[PDB]
Scaffold this active site. Structure first.
Site, PDB file in Angstrom:
ATOM      1  CG  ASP A  14      -2.093  -1.013   1.021  1.00 45.24           C
ATOM      2  OD1 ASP A  14      -2.452  -1.346  -0.124  1.00 45.24           O
ATOM      3  OD2 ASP A  14      -2.609  -1.490   2.052  1.00 45.24           O
ATOM      4  CE  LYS A  42       3.704  -2.820  -4.185  1.00 46.66           C
ATOM      5  NZ  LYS A  42       4.249  -4.137  -3.783  1.00 46.66           N
ATOM      6  CB  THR A  43      -1.679  -0.388  -8.793  1.00 44.39           C
ATOM      7  OG1 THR A  43      -1.430  -1.702  -8.281  1.00 44.39           O
ATOM      8  CG2 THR A  43      -2.510  -0.498 -10.050  1.00 44.39           C
ATOM      9  CG  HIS A  61      -0.159  -8.929   1.093  1.00 41.20           C
ATOM     10  ND1 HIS A  61      -0.429  -7.670   0.605  1.00 41.20           N
ATOM     11  CD2 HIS A  61      -1.140  -9.206   1.983  1.00 41.20           C
ATOM     12  CE1 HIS A  61      -1.528  -7.206   1.174  1.00 41.20           C
ATOM     13  NE2 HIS A  61      -1.978  -8.120   2.015  1.00 41.20           N
TER      14      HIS A  61
HETATM   15  N1  LIG Z   1      -2.195  11.644  -1.694  1.00 42.88           N
HETATM   16  C1  LIG Z   1      -1.592  10.509  -2.113  1.00 42.88           C
HETATM   17  N2  LIG Z   1      -2.311   9.358  -2.152  1.00 42.88           N
HETATM   18  C2  LIG Z   1      -1.747   8.198  -2.566  1.00 42.88           C
HETATM   19  C3  LIG Z   1      -0.338   8.216  -2.970  1.00 42.88           C
HETATM   20  N3  LIG Z   1      -0.028   6.961  -3.332  1.00 42.88           N
HETATM   21  C4  LIG Z   1      -1.140   6.204  -3.172  1.00 42.88           C
HETATM   22  N4  LIG Z   1      -2.165   6.937  -2.710  1.00 42.88           N
HETATM   23  C5  LIG Z   1      -3.532   6.428  -2.434  1.00 42.88           C
HETATM   24  O1  LIG Z   1      -3.500   5.186  -1.728  1.00 42.88           O
HETATM   25  C6  LIG Z   1      -4.523   4.320  -2.221  1.00 42.88           C
HETATM   26  C7  LIG Z   1      -4.049   2.877  -2.246  1.00 42.88           C
HETATM   27  O2  LIG Z   1      -2.714   2.830  -2.737  1.00 42.88           O
HETATM   28  P1  LIG Z   1      -2.272   1.716  -3.808  1.00 42.88           P
HETATM   29  O3  LIG Z   1      -1.786   2.416  -5.053  1.00 42.88           O
HETATM   30  O4  LIG Z   1      -3.361   0.675  -3.896  1.00 42.88           O
HETATM   31  O5  LIG Z   1      -1.002   1.054  -3.090  1.00 42.88           O
HETATM   32  P2  LIG Z   1      -0.316  -0.242  -3.737  1.00 42.88           P
HETATM   33  O6  LIG Z   1       1.046  -0.380  -3.183  1.00 42.88           O
HETATM   34  O7  LIG Z   1      -0.256  -0.070  -5.332  1.00 42.88           O
HETATM   35  C8  LIG Z   1      -1.299  -1.696  -3.291  1.00 42.88           C
HETATM   36  P3  LIG Z   1      -0.394  -3.216  -3.653  1.00 42.88           P
HETATM   37  O8  LIG Z   1       0.829  -3.265  -2.829  1.00 42.88           O
HETATM   38  O9  LIG Z   1      -1.315  -4.484  -3.293  1.00 42.88           O
HETATM   39  O10 LIG Z   1      -0.009  -3.234  -5.214  1.00 42.88           O
HETATM   40  C9  LIG Z   1      -4.833   4.776  -3.632  1.00 42.88           C
HETATM   41  O11 LIG Z   1      -6.249   4.797  -3.837  1.00 42.88           O
HETATM   42  C10 LIG Z   1      -4.231   6.162  -3.758  1.00 42.88           C
HETATM   43  O12 LIG Z   1      -5.256   7.129  -3.983  1.00 42.88           O
HETATM   44  C11 LIG Z   1       0.376   9.511  -2.901  1.00 42.88           C
HETATM   45  O13 LIG Z   1       1.576   9.606  -3.227  1.00 42.88           O
HETATM   46  N5  LIG Z   1      -0.300  10.578  -2.472  1.00 42.88           N
HETATM   47 MG   LIG Z   2      -2.143  -3.656  -8.021  1.00 46.26          MG
END
Ligand SMILES: Nc1nc2c(ncn2[C@@H]2O[C@H](COP(=O)(O)OP(=O)(O)CP(=O)(O)O)[C@@H](O)[C@H]2O)c(=O)[nH]1
Ligand SMILES: [Mg+2]
Ligand SMILES: CC[C@H](C)[C@H](N)C(=O)O
Ligand SMILES: [Mg+2]
Ligand SMILES: [Mg+2]
Ligand SMILES: [Mg+2]
Ligand SMILES: [Mg+2]
Ligand SMILES: [Mg+2]
Ligand SMILES: [Mg+2]
Ligand SMILES: [Mg+2]
Ligand SMILES: [Mg+2]
Ligand SMILES: [Mg+2]
Ligand SMILES: [Mg+2]
Ligand SMILES: [Mg+2]
Ligand SMILES: [Mg+2]
Ligand SMILES: [Mg+2]
Ligand SMILES: [Mg+2]
Ligand SMILES: [Mg+2]
Ligand SMILES: [Mg+2]
Ligand SMILES: [Mg+2]
Ligand SMILES: [Mg+2]
Ligand SMILES: [Mg+2]
Ligand SMILES: [Mg+2]
Ligand SMILES: [Mg+2]
Ligand SMILES: [Mg+2]
Ligand SMILES: [Mg+2]
Ligand SMILES: [Mg+2]
Ligand SMILES: [Mg+2]
Ligand SMILES: [Mg+2]
Ligand SMILES: [Mg+2]
Ligand SMILES: [Mg+2]
Ligand SMILES: [Mg+2]
Ligand SMILES: [Mg+2]
Ligand SMILES: [Mg+2]
Ligand SMILES: [Mg+2]
Ligand SMILES: [Mg+2]
Ligand SMILES: [Mg+2]
Ligand SMILES: [Mg+2]
Ligand SMILES: [Mg+2]
Ligand SMILES: [Mg+2]
Ligand SMILES: [Mg+2]
Ligand SMILES: [Mg+2]
Ligand SMILES: [Mg+2]
Ligand SMILES: [Mg+2]
Ligand SMILES: [Mg+2]
Ligand SMILES: [Mg+2]
Ligand SMILES: [Mg+2]
Ligand SMILES: [Mg+2]
Ligand SMILES: [Mg+2]
Ligand SMILES: [Mg+2]
Ligand SMILES: [Mg+2]
Ligand SMILES: [Mg+2]
Ligand SMILES: [Mg+2]
Ligand SMILES: [Mg+2]
Ligand SMILES: [Mg+2]
Ligand SMILES: [Mg+2]
Ligand SMILES: [Mg+2]
Ligand SMILES: [Mg+2]
Ligand SMILES: [Mg+2]
Ligand SMILES: [Mg+2]
Ligand SMILES: [Mg+2]
Ligand SMILES: [Mg+2]
Ligand SMILES: [Mg+2]
Ligand SMILES: [Mg+2]
Ligand SMILES: [Mg+2]
Ligand SMILES: [Mg+2]
Ligand SMILES: [Mg+2]
Ligand SMILES: [Mg+2]
Ligand SMILES: [Mg+2]
Ligand SMILES: [Mg+2]
Ligand SMILES: [Mg+2]
Ligand SMILES: [Mg+2]
Ligand SMILES: [Mg+2]
Ligand SMILES: [Mg+2]
Ligand SMILES: [Mg+2]
Ligand SMILES: [Mg+2]
Ligand SMILES: [Mg+2]
Ligand SMILES: [Mg+2]
Ligand SMILES: [Mg+2]
Ligand SMILES: [Mg+2]
Ligand SMILES: [Mg+2]
Ligand SMILES: [Mg+2]
Ligand SMILES: [Mg+2]
Ligand SMILES: [Mg+2]
Ligand SMILES: [Mg+2]
Ligand SMILES: [Mg+2]
Ligand SMILES: [Mg+2]
Ligand SMILES: [Mg+2]
Ligand SMILES: [Mg+2]
Ligand SMILES: [Mg+2]
Ligand SMILES: [Mg+2]
Ligand SMILES: [Mg+2]
Ligand SMILES: [Mg+2]
Ligand SMILES: [Mg+2]
Ligand SMILES: [Mg+2]
Lengths: 392, 205, 86
Positions: A21, A24-25, A84
RNA sequence: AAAUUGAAGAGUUUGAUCAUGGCUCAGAUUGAACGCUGGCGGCAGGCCUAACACAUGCAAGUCGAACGGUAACAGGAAGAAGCUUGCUUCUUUGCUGACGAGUGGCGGACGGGUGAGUAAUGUCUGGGAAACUGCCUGAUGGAGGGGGAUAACUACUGGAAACGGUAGCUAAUACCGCAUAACGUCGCAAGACCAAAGAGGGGGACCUUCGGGCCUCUUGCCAUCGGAUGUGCCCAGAUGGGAUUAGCUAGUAGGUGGGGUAACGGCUCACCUAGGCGACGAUCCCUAGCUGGUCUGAGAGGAUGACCAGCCACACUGGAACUGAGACACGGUCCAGACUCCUACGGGAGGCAGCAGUGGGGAAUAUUGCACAAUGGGCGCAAGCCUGAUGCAGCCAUGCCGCGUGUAUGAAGAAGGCCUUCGGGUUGUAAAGUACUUUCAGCGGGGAGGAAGGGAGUAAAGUUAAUACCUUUGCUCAUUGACGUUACCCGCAGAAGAAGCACCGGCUAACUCCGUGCCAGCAGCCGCGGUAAUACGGAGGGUGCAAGCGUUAAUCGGAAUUACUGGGC
RNA sequence: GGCCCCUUAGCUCAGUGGUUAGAGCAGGCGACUCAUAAUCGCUUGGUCGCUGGUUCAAGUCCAGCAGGGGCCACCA
């Protein structure tokens, strides 16, 4: 219908690694959107990526997602990995084929155990170049703590032989960049520039019989069974005949069609992630862990001797010796198989820092030849690594 | 499609030299003819009707060197013709090419004749025939090719087969090594140690 | 359809039906007028109706909309019916 | 001259015998499947189960010598860049060759797929009378003169799209009258009535509004009687199982009249008569496409309908009809239904039992290939276009046939296994040794046949006014092969790259050691194993087949064991 | 690719982490028999599926595999 591929810009593989979280996506979507905005046509969307119900219901990632973009230096293929601690095999598969890695660390959370695990498995598979990109700089912008975070991540990288005091760090938030503001997408441009500058072009050895590890299996309706993977060394052409050698008995078929990102490729050179359609094969026959190679190139093996070094202390791993009956999971190329090990006369104990000679027998044979690099891991703990010494 | 083992064992089982060797020596000084092969050779148990029929059929097959399928087809063909089946079978098996080549002195044994035929060294009526079982009809001229006339084996066996009886229907000039038929053979010209009615009985079951 | 050769044929087929229906209707109308003429009992009217019905059926049979035997059956049946009464 | 030469038994009921009676075996075959093994070629065959659902791409067009025109392409002139004054550059012509879309003609009902339905609305054999028939062919004739329209196009415009609508203009071999008519239709007769289309080649005798008129030739266009092909209709006999299915039928059986069809007919209606089928099996239920033929048998019979040829039925399911010489129409139309898609939410689109391919079902059945070179087919005067028919190639020991995996000489009767009476025997001329040959595969070099025709030139003879167009025959000249690196022949180095499977108690060809001990196990049938197993497991030896060898499934024979030939109480 | 489940003597089964995991039907030995059944005279038996961890201390608490079983995805 279909559009062909224009072999004009160099191809390279990149991937993303970091704690759960930390965006990364979101970072991948932001970078592809920005790159298509300046020049290109990719502009990927978010929910179009995570298609599985569990992806959108739980807000997580279960596997590795493939994307593409390009800059007027090269053409990059990107892989998105989970974070994870029980989807490790997918991350190992993602890191094995990727030439370059980008590590995501948030200043809000800082380094986390999964980041250390990702770096350690990247080292144990041998990713040469890692670039760090700081995340979530929109909610924290204090210069007096980003220095501490940078020092911590530099220490993490330098602890395991990576260049840490010279690797760059990019600060920015992916959410603002994907939103489409006027200034937060320049950090994406800096990341891409440092990506091109920090990844020198590697060798392209296509001068030996074709070999392809298998990572995923698909059924294209109307057409048939398709394998996916990145060509290691050699070259294949439509109409050639290849052979499947792996855990199950050896078979043969023909490469009757090639594709790459649903764009046709006339002939796949070594070092490209492509999908190959194989004639007259039912889906359950071919599985990941097998190899697709030119006839008369490699043959299976069961027992062989190697030199194994249990990881020394203060580096992770474990803390206790091992003896007869030890059954650790060998990770070779992409396959994890648990097998039996044997140590010679004397040296019964295993010390954390003594590299010893072992003979290992595996239950499922694999296409193996002298001089292969395989890691050792069991019980949610990577213990050591070594290289092949003799094939028996 | 041939036999690729020991040669004297066949005659030792059949209890008679089957002409499988050239004849530079005598059989008695090559193998123990009266002793059947293996660990069990001394004892002579008593046969049956099936035993005698099988043993005779095997004897003829081993004499000429023809496997079972061709022999059965020969039997059907011989019964297909007009006349006695045993005489017809003997005429049919006597009219194939490698047998005639052997009987005309060009080969030491049947296998020598087979190598000569199958290595494209014989002209029949001027043309090359390569096949061992090529059926031959009256008035056919048989000769060797001019490239092979300098071999030593053919000249060695040319002046070695005149100790054997001269066939009464293969008119041969050994100088230009040219042979010809005149007509079919007959039981009057064939050996007297075959009882063809046993074969006719065996395939009529 | 899907082969660009039967669409043309469908077009001529519907045009041909639309053209043939009018001729069939006119011919039937004239014949049933003749039948009504016999029905009334007016021999002169029936005879006249037959006189100007004959060309219509003969021309239509020549055109092919009906068959020679069809026109012959109509003509003969009407002649027998009319000549019965007086 | 030939088209016939054809008939075999064994094991098992008892202490032993004869008889009756069932069970098992030895042969031939197959659209086969599984296990072990696997060198080459020739000719054949390859979803038997889900008539279950389908992504993608091909499988039916052609005619300008019917027509109105010029969307694309190729053939001229003048303006006009510079002058070597047209070197070079650019724009304006349907007169010509060709031709997108449109009217018109022909085909699309052929060719290809499948066996669901169908026990007699079908098929097989033998007959018949009440019918029609494009194209092909024979004979005798006509081939005169008018008229009102519309597509494309022009203007406007509806609509997401598919697809429209409104107002004018134009061509015919498009359409409709008229003129005359029969050997033709109706009619006893007298009489009454019905058709047509024009194109193309060359030009002498004779004139132009210089459009052409005018001559001849090739082809069509309409009416009647014939030939051929094709299709529709009727009758008799033959064409599976059940009586634990015995009665069935009211348009039902016949008659008169009206109508209907290309034609007879309850084909259809109004009325009359009260009949009709059935133990020679009607009615009812189950299964099933039929035939020439295929396997078996000495025959008589039994089982059967994969490949090829004749007939029939179907085309997602249920109905219906138009068009046409031919259909109630596989790649057409209308409606309803179940599924799958596009949509702007108003509405639209689709049917692999055509060729490849996918999922599923199953013990199990193949490439999203090349070409019209040849044989046939549609269209056209021809050239020619189209053809997943067809001719080939690919995958599969699935079947039949052929060939190879060397050939000689060689006792030391060698090591090594195995057995032994410890003497020796065996594997065994087998090997190793010595001397020769190169089939097939490997490489190189040369090289038939499927090819007939089509085009161009030239000459003779034909018809006409004509040396003209056109036709016939000859002759002459360069080209047409996917298969294909064809078949086939020659040269090179070297025995060099190439053998497995079942069986050994009797039936049935082939025998001994060790291990176990009614345990582990074998078995087509009698039957083996309880501490000395020719029957289990291993080894040595031997027998039968062989690029195959065995096991399972299914049919006839043996079985005179459904007995007509040919049995019994 | 993800989640949830079952693994104790030959068969059926018990076994709440304090010191060698027990029951039944089975089975072996000695007599008797050609060999058993029955009567007698003694009764042996265990990788707690494997591997590695935490507890002073484990089949039993924890993690990864072996094999089977029930669901959920994914489409060059
Ligand atoms: N304001 C802000 N919000 C962010 C940033 N990065 C991620 N988020 C918020 O956090 C939420 C979840 O983050 P996500 O992109 O799912 O994290 P992830 O690491 O890709 C999840 P996984 O590890 O399973 O691939 C997103 O809906 C996004 O809006 C950032 O740099 N700034
Ligand atoms: Mg993903
Ligand atoms: C990187 C893999 C992608 C999806 C590829 N073009 C297919 O498969
Ligand atoms: Mg031989
Ligand atoms: Mg032989
Ligand atoms: Mg005969
Ligand atoms: Mg016979
Ligand atoms: Mg027999
Ligand atoms: Mg009306
Ligand atoms: Mg008998
Ligand atoms: Mg017998
Ligand atoms: Mg008995
Ligand atoms: Mg007895
Ligand atoms: Mg009997
Ligand atoms: Mg027989
Ligand atoms: Mg097999
Ligand atoms: Mg088997
Ligand atoms: Mg097998
Ligand atoms: Mg199927
Ligand atoms: Mg079928
Ligand atoms: Mg079928
Ligand atoms: Mg279907
Ligand atoms: Mg298509
Ligand atoms: Mg024109
Ligand atoms: Mg012209
Ligand atoms: Mg014209
Ligand atoms: Mg015409
Ligand atoms: Mg052109
Ligand atoms: Mg014109
Ligand atoms: Mg013109
Ligand atoms: Mg033309
Ligand atoms: Mg046209
Ligand atoms: Mg036709
Ligand atoms: Mg059929
Ligand atoms: Mg049929
Ligand atoms: Mg019959
Ligand atoms: Mg007019
Ligand atoms: Mg519009
Ligand atoms: Mg006109
Ligand atoms: Mg009109
Ligand atoms: Mg008229
Ligand atoms: Mg006119
Ligand atoms: Mg004319
Ligand atoms: Mg017909
Ligand atoms: Mg009969
Ligand atoms: Mg029948
Ligand atoms: Mg009537
Ligand atoms: Mg009709
Ligand atoms: Mg009738
Ligand atoms: Mg059926
Ligand atoms: Mg059938
Ligand atoms: Mg019959
Ligand atoms: Mg018969
Ligand atoms: Mg017979
Ligand atoms: Mg009989
Ligand atoms: Mg026969
Ligand atoms: Mg007979
Ligand atoms: Mg016979
Ligand atoms: Mg049939
Ligand atoms: Mg069939
Ligand atoms: Mg057929
Ligand atoms: Mg055929
Ligand atoms: Mg169909
Ligand atoms: Mg229908
Ligand atoms: Mg349907
Ligand atoms: Mg009609
Ligand atoms: Mg279709
Ligand atoms: Mg198909
Ligand atoms: Mg399939
Ligand atoms: Mg299946
Ligand atoms: Mg199979
Ligand atoms: Mg093709
Ligand atoms: Mg085909
Ligand atoms: Mg096989
Ligand atoms: Mg073959
Ligand atoms: Mg053979
Ligand atoms: Mg010896
Ligand atoms: Mg010895
Ligand atoms: Mg030729
Ligand atoms: Mg046997
Ligand atoms: Mg057997
Ligand atoms: Mg026998
Ligand atoms: Mg046998
Ligand atoms: Mg015997
Ligand atoms: Mg046995
Ligand atoms: Mg038995
Ligand atoms: Mg013993
Ligand atoms: Mg034995
Ligand atoms: Mg065979
Ligand atoms: Mg059988
Ligand atoms: Mg049988
Ligand atoms: Mg009988
Ligand atoms: Mg019997
Ligand atoms: Mg009796
Ligand atoms: Mg009595």
């Amino acid at each position: 219908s279909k559009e062909k591929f224009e072999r004009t810009k160099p191809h390279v593989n990149v991937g993303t690694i970091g704690h759960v979280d930390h965006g990364k996506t979101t970072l991948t979507a932001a970078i592809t959107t920005v790159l298509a905005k300046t020049y290109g046509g990719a502009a990927r969307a978010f929910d179009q990526i995570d298609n599985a119900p569990e992806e959108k219901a739980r807000g997580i990632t279960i596997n590795t997602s493939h994307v593409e973009y390009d800059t007027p230096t090269r053409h990059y293929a990107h892989v998105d990995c989970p974070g994870h601690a029980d989807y490790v095999k997918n991350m190992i598969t993602g890191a094995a084929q990727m030439d370059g890695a980008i590590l995501v660390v948030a200043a809000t959370d800082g380094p986390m155990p999964q980041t250390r695990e990702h770096i350690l498995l990247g080292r144990q598979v041998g990713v040469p170049y890692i670039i760090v990109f700081l995340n979530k700089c929109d909610m924290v912008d204090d210069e007096e703590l980003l220095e501490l975070v940078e020092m911590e991540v530099r220490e993490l990288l330098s602890q395991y032989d990576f260049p840490g005091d010279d690797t760059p760090i990019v600060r920015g938030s992916a959410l603002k960049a994907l939103e489409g503001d006027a200034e937060w997408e320049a950090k994406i441009l800096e990341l891409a520039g440092f990506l091109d500058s920090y990844i020198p072009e590697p060798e392209r050895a296509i001068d030996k019989p074709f070999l392809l590890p298998i990572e995923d299996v698909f059924s294209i309706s109307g057409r048939g069974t398709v394998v996916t993977g990145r060509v290691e060394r050699g070259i294949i052409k439509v109409g050639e005949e290849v052979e499947i050698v792996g855990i199950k008995e050896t078979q043969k078929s023909t490469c009757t069609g090639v594709e790459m990102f649903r764009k046709l490729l006339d002939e796949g050179r070594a070092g490209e992630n492509v999908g190959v359609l194989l004639r007259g094969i039912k889906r359950e026959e071919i599985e990941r862990g097998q190899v697709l190679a030119k006839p008369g190139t490699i043959k299976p093996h069961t027992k062989f001797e190697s030199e194994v070094y249990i990881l020394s202390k203060d580096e992770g791993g474990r803390h206790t010796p091992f003896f007869k009956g030890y059954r650790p999971q060998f990770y070779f190329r992409t396959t994890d198989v648990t097998g039996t090990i044997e140590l010679p006369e004397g040296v019964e104990m295993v010390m954390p820092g003594d590299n010893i000679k072992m003979v290992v027998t595996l239950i499922h044979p694999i296409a193996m030849d002298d001089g292969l690099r395989f890691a050792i891991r069991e019980g949610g703990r990577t213990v050591g690594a070594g290289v092949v010494a003799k094939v028996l | 499609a041939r036999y690729l083992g020991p040669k004297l064992k066949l005659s030792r089982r059949e209890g008679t030299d089957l002409f499988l060797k050239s004849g530079v020596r005598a059989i008695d000084t090559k193998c123990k003819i009266e002793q059947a092969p293996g660990q069990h050779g001394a004892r002579k148990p008593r046969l049956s009707d099936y035993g005698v029929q099988l043993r005779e059929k095997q004897k003829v097959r081993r004499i000429y060197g023809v496997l079972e399928r061709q022999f059965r087809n020969y039997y059907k063909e011989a019964a297909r013709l007009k006349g006695n089946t045993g005489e017809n079978l003997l005429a049919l098996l006597e009219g194939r090419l490698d047998n005639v080549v052997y009987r005309m002195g060009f080969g030491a044994t049947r296998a020598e004749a087979r190598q000569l035929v199958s290595h494209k060294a014989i002209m029949v009526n001027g043309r090359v025939v390569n096949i061992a079982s090529y059926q031959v009809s009256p008035n056919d001229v048989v000769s060797i090719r001019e490239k092979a006339k300098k071999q030593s084996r053919v000249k060695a066996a040319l002046e070695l087969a005149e100790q054997r009886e001269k066939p009464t229907w293969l008119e041969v000039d050994a100088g230009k090594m040219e042979g010809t038929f005149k007509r079919k053979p007959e039981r009057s010209d064939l050996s007297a140690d075959i009882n063809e009615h046993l074969i006719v009985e065996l395939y009529s079951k | 359809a899907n082969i660009k050769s039967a669409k043309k044929r469908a077009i001529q087929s519907e045009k041909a039906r639309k053209h043939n229906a009018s001729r069939r209707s006119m011919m039937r109308t004239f014949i049933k007028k003749v039948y009504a003429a016999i029905e009334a009992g007016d021999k002169a009217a029936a005879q006249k109706a037959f006189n100007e019905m004959q060309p219509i059926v003969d021309r239509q049979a020549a055109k092919g909309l009906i068959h020679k035997n069809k026109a012959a059956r109509h003509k003969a049946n009407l002649t027998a019916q009319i000549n019965k009464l007086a």
